């Protein structure tokens, strides 16, 4: 009971982990053990996925979120995203699961056996939350680590087999990236793009050269920034702007993770380059477009002139104009005209969908893709009944895009809440009123009346 | 020697883990039977003969879909007593005819009477004013208007709510399609009383928790309160300044505050009960006549009101054949209202 | 002092009748703009082509609505998620036709309400209060984000945002039930437990404290004169209240600690409403309520309907009728 009850720590059992704020040794244990839980899940979930996996069904009919991540990196797949070799999946699973034992070992050791505080044992590993230079130094180490991680993605893409490229000419395939985009006008340009429709900020990234190029930039930015924080101490304007405490630094990081979570939600819902539809299923926009393409194809085969077919409203039944003139599909999918995907682009010319190309050049593979995507739109029930809410039981399907978007919206939201909880708390505790108002120095009693 | 009545009174009013009282004699059996009847029916009893539905765990339903369903429409408003002229003492037939519906509804009603008598009985013994009983009149008005008056105005008990999670959802959606109940201003006042009540609950709990006096050294602040302490545990003055500056007005009287917390959700439920008394009679806020005159004469005039009526028309046509099996409706595909494509 | 310092002291002054603050400098202009645009639109905006099919819906009072039917109508489906400020339109006439006021209102409102929440943290800091009133407000705020922003993002259009009006709200609700089976979604069910339970505990707490007010007034005066603003002593006997409620249920079902009680009053609705906000924000990406349609089957394979099947029939009626000229193909995929 060195701080292990409410009487001595000041924290109840339900706020038990707050007993660790000034116990750097046990807190290192907490962290390392936790890192082990993450790595454990990556490893075990992968093996579970692989055990359940039938390589000839699409991944997206099988409730896989991890295999799709491995495949996107170029491992285990060939043209069209066909699975050629499951062993790289097995390796990723096993190596995480083994590594998790090591992290788990270190965590348990530091939490229950090693020294509770580190400051007596080591001036390098010990830390005071108020030591601005030590905090920026540890930050700096972690920056360098993250930088190296980003450069590993570059290394995979450029020197160790490449990445799955859904846009590869002649059809999706693994491709080595030799000319990554380095021009800062392109890379930083993405950051100044509007997040609204037809723009989509960084979510719009639509080619692997930009993706790889962007990670070269982030790799170097993080390594540089890390060196910077090792060699420097916060400037005075930073000193006056922030609160300097463990709970405050937690809050900043909670806000950042909430943001990233919302971003990730949008990425998987709309982006079909770094979340290839071959592995994750069609996007919501995609499947709605694919429906319009399906019936255009069908009805044109029956003899319809799809260009001149006026629908009930007076707008074109199959084809119409966007508000800036481009030719787009009609019906409700008018909203989704910013969609772009490799099955559809061959039909697009400088004015939008090209009617000559529609009439003469639609290949059987485009009909197949469109029918597939129309019938695996990311709609389904919580018990995994695929389709619209009035659908009967039969098809066991919820898109990986839905599972991934929903989960991450939920987590980003509660992380925003945590940011406010901890940021408000850190401010109050730094100023000395987190446990309540001093009855004999109640500030409002020294203020003039409002009226 | 004191009298037997007084001796029974002593024993009924002994301080025990579960207070009993004279109210207990009505409350306990009626509550226990309502609850046991619901657990029995949802676990074991069908609705095949009354509705043509499966409704029990035995038949394969889950917690969301089980129910004790209302009796068939041909039963009218029969009490459906076990020994009555429909079941004639046959427990099995009684179950099949929906006898557990009336069993649960009537024992539940008498049990709610017993619960509010309990609230008065305990208040009197402990020496407090009976506002909790008074607040409970809202749940009573709701139960009575919805489970009793509403079906009594209609053809039969069949159109009461059935006791189940999905069944109640069905009751909501029926009310939208047939009664346009969202349009009804007595419902609207109910919504304001319920959401306003939930708002008051959240804002008041949060305000007290964030204007607490520091009365302890703990970072966990719950221990720094003693039930017998004479002093306010939070600052009303500071709370008042905060809300005055944030929202423009604030409570300054704690007695008014707590009274208002009773008033808002109790009044809202009472308003909703009055609307459902109207619906017993199909006396709905279904339409705005002026809207209909315009829309009929002017085929380019559209509002969200006219849109919702198209939804209601869809609900009635598509649900009625299966939801009202005694009507023997057959609606050929060609007569069903549908928009384009769907 | 210098002008900036004086300005900062005025912005953050604890003595202004209404607190301004740095969140306030963004809140004030954005809420004024949303308010002014809303009021004028609700009175006088012409009809808006919400579903992008050249079928404009009348929302305003002057164009044939009343208070119950009126609305500011969402922006055209032809726009989708595109940003449609006033300066993107060729004229105010176009802007009105295509539902520009909706986007101006909702974007300024969500920004302003977000700053309202920050302003609550801010004033609490200046007054030396604990900081978490703003956390309670995050519940209704999240709900507003869900129906005005996150649902549109998921479905690909602001035309699927909740309309700014009474009957429009009911329209949004009915279509949502058709497309998501929200009633069968456990997060909406948590929401109902949150608001029904918030109402219940609201009435319970009001009634218990009122039951136990200390006698301080005569029969010809409101008991409310028995409490004086700022008095140090509690105005009710919590031990009498707990004595009552503990007997009503049983002793350990009742709170004798006011701090614990008040935390519960905060938590129960806030949490349930966080779940219902998340119901709307996850159905935004079409993870929908439970579907037990045709779940119960007899020995031959005949479908035995349950109350879930009857819900399904109602949902179908909503589905086939909604936006009756807008669908050309057989599935409503967004």
């Amino acid at each position: 009971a060195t701080n292990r009850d409410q009487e001595s720590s000041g924290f109840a059992w339900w706020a038990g982990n707050a007993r660790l704020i000034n116990l750097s040794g046990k807190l290192l244990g907490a962290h390392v053990a936790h890192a082990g839980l993450i790595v454990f899940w990556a490893g075990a979930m992968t093996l579970f996925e692989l055990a359940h996996f039938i390589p000839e069904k699409p991944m997206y009919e099988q409730g896989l979120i991890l295999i799709p991540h491995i495949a996107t990196l170029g491992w285990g797949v060939g043209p069209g995203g066909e699975v050629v070799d499951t062993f790289p999946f097995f390796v990723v699973g096993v190596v995480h699961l083994i590594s998790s034992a090591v992290l788990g070992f270190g965590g348990v050791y530091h939490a229950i056996r090693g020294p509770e505080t580190l400051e007596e044992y080591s001036s390098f590993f010990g830390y005071d939350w108020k030591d601005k230079n030590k905090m920026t130094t540890i930050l700096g180490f972690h920056l360098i680590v993250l930088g190296i991680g980003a450069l590993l993605l570059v290394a995979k893409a450029m020197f160790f087999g490449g990445l799955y490229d859904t846009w590869a000419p002649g059809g999706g395939d693994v491709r080595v990236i030799t000319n990554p985009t380095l021009d800062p006008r392109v890379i930083f340009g993405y950051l100044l793009k509007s997040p609204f429709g037809g723009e989509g900020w960084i979510v719009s990234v639509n080619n692997l050269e930009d993706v790889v190029g962007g990670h070269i930039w982030i790799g170097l930015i993080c390594i540089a920034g890390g060196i910077w924080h090792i060699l420097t101490t916060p400037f005075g304007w930073a000193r006056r702007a922030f609160i300097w405490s463990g709970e405050a630094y937690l809050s900043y990081s909670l806000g950042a993770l909430s943001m990233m979570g919302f971003i990730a939600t949008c990425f998987v819902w709309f982006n079909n380059t770094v979340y290839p539809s071959e592995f994750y299923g069609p996007t919501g926009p995609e499947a709605s477009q694919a429906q319009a393409m399906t019936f255009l194809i069908r009805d044109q085969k029956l003899g319809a002139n799809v260009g001149s077919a006026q629908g009930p409203t007076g707008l074109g039944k199959y084809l119409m104009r966007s508000p800036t003139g481009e030719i787009i599909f009609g019906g409700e999918t008018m909203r989704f005209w910013d969609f772009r995907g490799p099955w559809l682009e061959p039909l697009r010319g400088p004015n939008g969908l090209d009617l000559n190309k529609i009439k003469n050049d639609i290949q059987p593979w485009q009909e197949r893709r469109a029918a597939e995507y129309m019938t695996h739109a990311p709609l389904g029930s919580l018990n995994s009944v695929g389709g619209v809410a009035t659908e009967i039981n039969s098809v066991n399907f919820v898109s990986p895009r839905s599972w991934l978007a929903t989960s991450h919206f939920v987590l980003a939201f509660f992380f925003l809440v945590g940011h406010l909880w901890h940021a408000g708390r850190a401010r109050a505790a730094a100023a000395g009123f987190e446990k309540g108002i001093d009855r004999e120095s109640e500030p409002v009693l020294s203020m003039p009346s409002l009226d | 020697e004191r009298g037997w009545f007084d001796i029974l009174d002593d024993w009924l009013k002994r301080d025990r883990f579960v207070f009993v009282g004279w109210s207990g004699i009505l409350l306990f059996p009626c509550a226990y039977l309502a609850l046991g009847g619901w657990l029995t029916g949802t676990t074991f009893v069908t609705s095949w003969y009354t509705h043509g539905l499966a409704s029990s765990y035995l038949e394969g339903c889950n917690f969301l879909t089980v129910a004790v369903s209302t009796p068939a429409n041909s039963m009218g408003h029969s009490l459906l007593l076990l020994w009555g002229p429909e079941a004639q003492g046959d427990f099995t037939r009684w179950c099949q005819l929906g006898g557990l519906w009336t069993f649960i509804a009537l024992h539940g009603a008498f049990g709610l009477i017993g619960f509010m008598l309990r609230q008065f009985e305990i208040a009197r013994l402990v020496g407090v004013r009976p506002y909790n009983a008074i607040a409970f009149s809202a749940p009573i008005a709701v139960f009575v208007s919805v489970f009793l008056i509403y079906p009594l105005g209609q053809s039969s008990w069949f159109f009461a709510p059935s006791f189940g999670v999905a069944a109640i959802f069905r009751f909501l959606l029926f009310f939208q399609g047939f009664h346009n109940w969202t349009l009804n201003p007595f419902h609207m006042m109910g919504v304001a009383g319920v959401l306003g009540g939930a708002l008051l609950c959240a804002i008041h709990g949060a305000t007290v928790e964030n204007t607490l006096f520091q009365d302890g050294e703990g970072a966990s602040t719950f221990r720094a309160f003693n039930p017998t302490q004479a002093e306010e545990t939070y600052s009303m003055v500071t709370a008042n300044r905060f809300w005055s500056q944030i929202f423009g007005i604030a409570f300054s009287n704690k007695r008014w505050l707590h009274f208002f917390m009773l008033f808002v959700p109790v009044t809202g439920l009472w308003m909703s009960a009055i609307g459902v008394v109207g619906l017993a009679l199909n006396l709905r806020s279904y339409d705005f006549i002026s809207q209909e005159i315009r829309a009929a004469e002017d085929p380019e005039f559209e509002t969200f009101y006219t849109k919702n009526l198209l939804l209601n028309e869809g609900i009635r046509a598509w649900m009625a054949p299966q939801d009202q099996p005694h009507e023997n409706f057959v609606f050929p595909e060609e007569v069903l209202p549908r928009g384009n494509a769907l | 002092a210098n002008l900036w310092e004086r300005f900062c002291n005025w912005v953050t002054s604890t003595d202004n009748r209404l607190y301004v603050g740095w969140f306030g400098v963004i809140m004030i202009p954005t809420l004024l703009a949303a308010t002014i645009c809303f009021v004028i639109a609700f009175i006088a905006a012409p009809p808006v082509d919400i579903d992008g099919i050249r079928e404009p819906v009348s929302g305003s009072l002057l164009y044939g609505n009343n208070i119950i039917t009126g609305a500011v109508v969402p922006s055209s489906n032809a726009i989708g998620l595109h940003f449609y400020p006033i300066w993107e339109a060729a004229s105010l006439d176009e802007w009105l036709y295509n539902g520009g006021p909706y986007q101006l209102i909702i974007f300024h409102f969500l920004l302003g309400a977000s700053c309202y929440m920050g302003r609550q943290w801010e004033l609490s800091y200046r007054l030396g209060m604990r900081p978490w009133i703003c956390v309670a407000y995050s519940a209704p705020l999240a709900s507003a984000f869900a129906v005005f922003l996150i649902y549109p993002i998921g479905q690909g259009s602001f035309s699927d945002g909740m309309p700014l009006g009474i009957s429009g709200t009911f329209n949004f609700m009915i279509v949502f039930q058709a497309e998501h089976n929200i009633l069968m979604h456990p997060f909406h069910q948590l929401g109902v437990a949150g608001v029904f339970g918030g109402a219940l505990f609201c009435a319970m707490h009001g009634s218990l404290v009122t039951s136990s007010l200390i006698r301080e007034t005569t029969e010809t005066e409101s008991a409310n004169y028995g409490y004086k603003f700022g008095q140090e002593e509690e105005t009710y006997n919590i031990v009498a209240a707990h004595g009552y409620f503990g007997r009503l249920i049983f002793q350990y079902a009742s709170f004798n600690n006011s701090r614990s009680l008040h935390f519960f009053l905060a938590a129960w609705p806030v949490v349930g409403v966080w779940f219902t906000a998340l119901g709307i924000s996850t159905m935004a990406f079409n993870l929908n309520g439970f579907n037990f349609n045709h779940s119960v089957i007899d020995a031959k394979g005949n479908v035995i309907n349950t109350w879930a099947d009857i819900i399904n029939r109602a949902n179908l009626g909503m589905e086939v009728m909604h936006e009756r000229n807008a669908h050309n193909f057989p599935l409503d995929l967004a």
Binding site: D451 | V237, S244 | I43, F229
Partner: peptide, 30 residues
């Protein structure tokens, strides 16, 4: 007539807000 009536009631409510805020009965601590 109807539009004037609905706008008039609204305008009265906005006026009531102004008086209820700025011409309130001041909270008095004593």
């Amino acid at each position: 007539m109807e539009t004037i009536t609905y706008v008039f009631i609204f305008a009265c409510i906005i006026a009531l807000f102004f008086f209820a805020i700025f011409f309130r009965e001041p909270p008095r601590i004593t």
